[PDB]
Amino acid sequence: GAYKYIQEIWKKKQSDAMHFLLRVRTWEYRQLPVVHRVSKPSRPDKARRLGYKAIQGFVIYRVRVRRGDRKKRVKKGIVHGKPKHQGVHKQKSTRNLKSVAEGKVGKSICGNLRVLNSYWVGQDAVYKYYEVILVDPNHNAVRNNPKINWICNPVHKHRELRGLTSAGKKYRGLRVKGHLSAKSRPSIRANWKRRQLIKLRKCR
Amino acid sequence: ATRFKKNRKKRGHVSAGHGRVGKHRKHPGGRGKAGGLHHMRINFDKYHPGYFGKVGMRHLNLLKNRTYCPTINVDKLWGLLPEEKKKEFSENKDIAPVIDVTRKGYFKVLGNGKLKHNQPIVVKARYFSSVAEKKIKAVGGQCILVA
Amino acid sequence: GRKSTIKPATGIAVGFNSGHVVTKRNSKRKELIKDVVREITGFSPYEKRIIELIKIGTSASTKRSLKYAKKKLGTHKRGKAKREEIQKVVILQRR
Amino acid sequence: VAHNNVLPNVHLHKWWQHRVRVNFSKNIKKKKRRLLREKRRKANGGTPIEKLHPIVHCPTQRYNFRTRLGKGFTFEELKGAGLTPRAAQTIGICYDKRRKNRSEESLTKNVERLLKYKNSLVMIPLKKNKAKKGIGGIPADADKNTIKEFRNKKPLLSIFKKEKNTKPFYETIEVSKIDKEFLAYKTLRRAKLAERRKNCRQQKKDIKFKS
Amino acid sequence: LSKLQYHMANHPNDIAVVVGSITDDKRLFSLKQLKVCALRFTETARKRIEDAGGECLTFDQLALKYPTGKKCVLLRGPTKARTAEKHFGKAPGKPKSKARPYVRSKGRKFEKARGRRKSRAYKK
Amino acid sequence: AVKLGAGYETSAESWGTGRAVARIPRVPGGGTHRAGQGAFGNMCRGGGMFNPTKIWRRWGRKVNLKEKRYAVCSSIAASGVTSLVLARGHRISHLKEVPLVVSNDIESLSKTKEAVNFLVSLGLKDEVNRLVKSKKIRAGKGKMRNRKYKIRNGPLIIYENDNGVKKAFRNIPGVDLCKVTKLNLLKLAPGGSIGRLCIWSESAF
RNA sequence: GAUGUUAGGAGGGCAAAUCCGCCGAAUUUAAGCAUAUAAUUAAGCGGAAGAAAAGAAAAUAACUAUGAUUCCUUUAGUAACGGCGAGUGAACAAGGACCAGCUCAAACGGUUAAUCCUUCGUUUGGUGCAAACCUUUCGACGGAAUUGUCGUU
RNA sequence: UUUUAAUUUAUUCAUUGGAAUUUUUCAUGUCGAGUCGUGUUCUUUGAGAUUGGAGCACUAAUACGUGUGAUACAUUUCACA
RNA sequence: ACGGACCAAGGAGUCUAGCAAAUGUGCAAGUGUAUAUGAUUCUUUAAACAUUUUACGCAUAAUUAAUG
RNA sequence: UCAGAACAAGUAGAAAACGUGAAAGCGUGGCCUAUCGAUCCUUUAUAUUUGCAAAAUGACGUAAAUUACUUACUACUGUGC
C-alpha cells in the first residue's frame, strides 16, 4: 500500500511538494560526482518495480548525463561530403540519455557489476540524473537465489553496452510489438541481412 | 555449355563480334534504365507506352487475401465431375448434381460458355455473375450462396 | 464488414453479418488513495488554471479551458477527459 | 535498355556478393535433422516425439474453408476433455492460454479429438510397478503385461496428423426439390447495397444496449 | 478435343489427322465416335476417345490404313493464339496496335499512365 | 571456387603514363623482385584469374520428376532389348534370354566367390573376364584427385530384398546392385548409354 | 560519506567468421547533379556466445478466425516509397523446420523474516592407487534485511 | 570407453508438508509515469497530413482504463491486445 | 601515323540473378513436389527414389483509380 | 513534320445543342500556309462515378412493432484528403 501511495505521489511530479523535493534532489546531485554510489534507492518503489531487490549484491548507482543533441564529431563544423549529410548541431543520437547513463556507469566504472536496470530520478536543463540498479554476479547471495541468478551467467556481461537493458530495448524499437516493428525484431541489422540474403539452391 | 557459346566461334576474329569502329565499351547507353525519357525516350514510347507517370488511387494496406476470388466459367462446371458420373447424370434427367465450387477451390462463378440444355445443375458458390446465374436458371438449376 | 453477436450469420459472402452458419458460443481503496494524494499534493499549475477557467462559467470559457487542456496533454480525447475530471472536482467543491 | 525486353528490375545494386547463401548442405542437413529426431525418439523410449495439436480453421476469406493443426488446446477444450492444463502439458497435449472459442461445434470437435487421444494412450507409471491413478486429467497406470503388449504393437502417429477433408463437392439432389426462384446475384448485390445502413443500425443498437 | 469434334461435324466416318498433340476439353459434355490419328494424345483425351467408343491411331497406323491419305482430314491447332504471338506485330506505342507489352505484373502501377490515356500525354 | 581475395590482396597501383612502362597496376616499394611488377589483372603473374570461379555457379540441374521417370522406363526397355545391350558393350553372345530373370535364391547368396560362379554359369564368364582386365590407371591428373583407376561397367543386379546380394556382389569389378523400388538412371544407363545388362530376381521383376 | 597492502572476491588485455550496440562516409547509379542511390554499407569505437540476438502479445486479423520468437518455402519484386526518375521495397495469411514456457512488481501472509550470506565447524556416504571430487543435515558466532527478504498467484 | 533407453524387485512401517481438480461461500483486488502520448526538430523507414528511434517543450489515464485496427480530424461503436 | 629488339610461358564477352525469343524434351487445363518429410538411403550417396493411409508459383479472364 | 511515335496545326465527318438565311446551305474561329509545350506537381471545374482498408455520421428517414441488441424498405450520408 505504501509503495502504491508513493507511486501515486510520484505521478504528480509538478504538484508543489513533489516539485520542491525534485528541485532539492537535482540541486544535491549537481554537487555530487557524475557517477557516485548511493546508499539506498531514492525511489525504492520504482527500484522494486524494475529489478531491485534487498539482497547483498544489489547496488544502486547515481549518474548524470548532459542533455541535448550531440554535435557530429568532425574537425571544425565542416562536413566533407554531399549536402544531405552536411548538417551538424541538430543531429540526434539513436540511444536514450538513460541508455548513455547506464552505459557509462556499467563500463569503466562498474565492469565487475552487471547493469540490471535504471530509472529517472530528476532533471535540470543541463543534466538528466538516473539511478541505476546493478548486481554483483559473483556474490553468493546472488549466485544462489534462483530468482535473479540468470544475471550471473556470462551471456549478460555488459547488457547495457548491447542495448539489452530496458532503454536499449526501447531505442532498438523492440518495445512496440506489431506491424509498427516489422523491420526490426530479431535485430534491425540482422533483419536487414536476412532481407538481403539471396538463396540459390544447390539444385536450383 | 561453354563449347557452344558464340564467343568461342568468334575466337580468331579481332573484335570478338562487337564491331571494329564502334567498339564494345562498358555501359555505353548509360546504366540500367538510364535516359528513359531523355536519350532513350523513343524506345520507351514504342515498347513501353504507359511506363512513366502514376495513375489512380493509392491503397496503403492491400491484403490480397481479402480480395481473392478465383473464377470458373460455367462452361467448365460439368467438367468438374468424373466421366462416368457425368454420363449417369445425363441419363437421369430426374436427379441434379450439386457442385460445391468452393470445395474445389473457386470463389466466383462466371458465365463464359454454354451448359447442356435441360440438364439442371445446383451450383454452390460465394459469388456469381448475373449472366452466369441467368444461364444456370435457364437450364433449370439453382445457385445456392455459400460462405 | 460488421457483424452481430445475437442472431446467426447469413450464409452470404458479403454484406452485414455475412458468413458461415456456425452457431456462436459467446474501487474504494483506490478512491481513498486518490483522495490522500490530492490532500498531499494539491493540483498542478495548468490544472489550477483549467479549474479557474471552468469556474468563470460560460461556454466560451469552457471552450478555452478545453483548448488549454489539449495544448498541455496533447490529444483531444485526453484533454476532454481532463476537463471532465476538473468539472467534477469543481462540482464536488461546490457541494 | 534496348529492344522489346521487359524493363530490368534486378535489385543487385548493393554489395550482394557479400550475402549469397548456396545450400550445398540441404540434403545433408535434412539427413542430420532426421538422425537427431531418431535419437530423440530413442531417448524417449516408447513415447512419441510429436505433441498433440488441435485442428483449427484458418483465418482470412481465402483459407477459411481449410483446417490445419493449431498450436495449443484452449482451457475450455481441456476442461471438456476432463483434464487440467498442467496435466495436459505433462502428457502429450499442447495447451494455448491465448486461444478462444467462438464456435461451439469447433469446440466439440476439439474435445472429441482429445477424448480419442486419451482413449488411444496408455500411461507408464512414474515409479515402476506401483500402479496409481492420475492427477486431475491424467488417466490410469496400467499393469506390466499390458504395457509390454502395447510396446509389441506399432505406435501409431495418425492422431498427430491433421484429418483430411471430408470430400463432398458432388451430391445428388432431386429436380423437384430445386427452387426455380432465387436470384442469387440480385440477393448479393442488394446485400452489398444495404451494408452501410445495416452497420449504422447495428451501431445504434449497440449504443442503446450500452444504456 | 472440342475443336476436333467441331471440325468433324460435317463429314462423319472419315479420319481426322492431327500432326501434333490432342488435349481434352472439360468444356465438352458429349464426345462423338471419333477416329483420330495424332502425333500425341494426352492421357485424359485418349481415355475420353476410348469412352466415346472411338479410335486412337498413331501416324504409322494411319499410314498403314491410308498410304494415299484417302478419306483423311488434316487439322491444325490455333497457332497465333499462343501467348508469345500476342507480343508480336506492331509494337504497343504504334497507334491501333493490339500487342501485349512485356511487363512485370498488372494493375495501375504498371504501364497504365503516360501514353495509355488521353489524360497523360497521349494514348497508345 | 578460387579463394575470394586471390590475386587482389595487393595494394599495387599504376604508376601512370610518364614512366615508360605499361599502365597495369604495379607493386609498390622496393627491395623485392615483386616490387615494381604487374599486380592483379588476368594477364599478370600472380594476378587474379579472369572470372574467378564462385560457389554460386549453378551446379545441380532440376529435372522434371515425370521426365526422370520416363528416362528410367526407357533405360529399362533398353536393358530388356538384347541388341541394345550388345551395342552398349556387354558380352551377351552366350546368354539365352536377355531380360535375365533368376530365382530368389540369389538374394540370399553370402559369398562373392559363389556369386562369381553363378555369373559364370549364366554365361557372363567372358564379361567377368573383361571386367577383370579393365581395371587400369587413368590417363591424366585424375590420378592425383582420388580417381586413380578406371573400371568398365558390368552387370546390374536388381533385387526385391537384401538377404546377401549387396555383400556378395560387392567387390566384383563393375557389378552394381539396386533395389527395384529405388532404381537409379545413372546406373541403368551409365554415361547416358542405353541398355545396361540387368540381372533381375523373379521377385524383383 | 571518506579511509584501509584490512578478510574474501570481480573488472581491464588478446581473438571475430557468425553475433549484438553504437558511430558513420564516399567512390558509385541517376548517362550532368543537388533529393535520392551506394547504405541504415566500409572504416572507427565498444561488447558477447557456441551460437548470439529475438521471444510468451498494449500480435494479426475482420475469418467458421488465427495465437511467443527464430528460420526456411512463399506472399513478392506485390502494397507502398521514389527530381513517381534512377531506383528501392516490406507485412498478414498459407506450407513447413522446431515447438516451452514462465517470475518479478503489485493483491494477500504480523499469534512476529517464515528469508539470505560470510567465517568456523560437525558426520554419514559414493567414486579414485593417489590428487581430488561428489553429495548428505546440522548448528553456532557474526552480519544483510522493516526504505521489504521469503511463501502465496 | 562414453551415456541412455528398454527390461528386473520391490516390500513393509512413520507422519510432516504440498499440489491438481471438485463443491459451496466472499473478493472484485491488482495490473510497471517525466512513462505513454501530443507538439516540434533531426534521423530512419516501403510507412505515404511521419514507421520506428532520438533531442527538446508540454505531460496523461486507471481497466467502463489506453494502445493497436497503415489518410489528418471530430462524435460513437466494435474487434483484438 | 601509333604499338612491336627477340623468344618461351601466362594473357581477355565470363559467371549468377530475373526477362526474351529461338529450338529441343516431358507433361498438358494444367504444370512445377517448394521447403520439408519418408525410407530395408548411406564408399560412391551432398544422388537417386518416394510424397503423407484445396501449400504456393505461373497459367485457366479480362477490365477499371476505384466499392468492384 | 514522321519512327509513318507524340505534341501542335489542320482536313473529313458523326451525335448533341444552336446561330444565320427565304431557302439550299454555311458556321467546331480568324481566306489559306506560322503564332507554341511531356511526366510530376499545383489549381479549379465536371459526375445518380468512387475510396480513405472492422465499422458508422443525410436519418432511428419511411413503414411497421413494443420498450428491445425488434422487422422490413429507401439513387441522393460528416470535415479533410
Ligand SMILES: [Mg+2]
Ligand atoms: Mg570476318
Ligand SMILES: [Mg+2]
Ligand atoms: Mg578494337
Ligand SMILES: [Mg+2]
Ligand atoms: Mg563512331
Ligand SMILES: [Mg+2]
Ligand atoms: Mg594466384
Ligand SMILES: [Mg+2]
Ligand atoms: Mg596430359
Ligand SMILES: [Mg+2]
Ligand atoms: Mg575487454
Ligand SMILES: [Mg+2]
Ligand atoms: Mg548518424
Ligand SMILES: [Mg+2]
Ligand atoms: Mg553520376
Ligand SMILES: [Mg+2]
Ligand atoms: Mg557516366
Ligand SMILES: [Mg+2]
Ligand atoms: Mg564495420
Ligand SMILES: [Mg+2]
Ligand atoms: Mg567471448
Ligand SMILES: [Mg+2]
Ligand atoms: Mg539469449
Ligand SMILES: [Mg+2]
Ligand atoms: Mg518471410
Ligand SMILES: [Mg+2]
Ligand atoms: Mg508473382
Ligand SMILES: [Mg+2]
Ligand atoms: Mg535502402
Ligand SMILES: [Mg+2]
Ligand atoms: Mg500494464
